[PDB]
Amino acid sequence: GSSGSSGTGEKPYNCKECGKSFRWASCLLKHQRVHSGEKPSGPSSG
Ligand SMILES: [Zn+2]
Secondary structure (H helix, E strand, O other): OOOOOOOOOOOOEEOOOOOOEEOOHHHHHHHHHHHOOOOOOOOOOO
8 A cells, every 4th residue: 555656667668559668679570470460360270
């Protein structure tokens, strides 16, 4: 029960596809690869 404290830190880069965060750009640009090609996760295994 603080209701107020110091420690407001958030990364500048933040993905919109899923809603993740990243310190550097490249770090995010690389993750964007997942939002480029869909992966077989579901109907794959009967
Ligand atoms: Zn994402």
